[PDB]
């Protein structure tokens, strides 16, 4: 309209969620609880010499 | 959703929120919590509501 241009007003997003990046160390001892179980039970058998004798 | 993405052990929790916590705490303190005008001085309906 004469020389000036008209633009459209903008909608605007009404909230915004922030989740950073993390690094990842990727430790392994973690996790391993199953060998510790493992250790647990081992469980060695002896059996009594000269009894039987 | 930052205990979430990452791996945190309901121990490991407790150490986060009590950052975010004293960090937004801190923030707070010094925010005076106003309203923004959005329509008319003359309107008695929004001032009611
Ligand atoms: C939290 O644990 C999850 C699951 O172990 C990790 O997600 C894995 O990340 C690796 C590395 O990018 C991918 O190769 C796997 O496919 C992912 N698995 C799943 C199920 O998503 C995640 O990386 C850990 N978070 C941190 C910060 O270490």
Do not use: W
């Not at chain 1, 909230?15 to 990046?21: D, F, H």
């Not at chain 2, 959703?1 to 950052?19: D, F, I, P, R, Y």
């Not at chain 2, 005076?32 to 509501?49: A, C, K, S, T, W």
């Amino acid at each position: 309209c004469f020389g000036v241009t008209f633009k459209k007003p903008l909608v605007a997003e009404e909230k915004t969620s922030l989740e950073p990046q993390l690094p990842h160390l990727q430790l392994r001892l973690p996790h391993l609880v199953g060998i510790i179980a493992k250790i647990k039970g081992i469980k060695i058998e002896v059996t009594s010499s000269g009894e039987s004798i | 959703n930052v205990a979430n993405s990452a791996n945190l052990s309901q121990e490991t929790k407790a150490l986060l929120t009590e950052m975010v916590n004293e960090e937004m705490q801190g923030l707070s303190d010094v925010m005076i919590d106003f309203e923004i005008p959005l329509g008319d001085p003359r309107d008695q309906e929004q001032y009611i509501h």
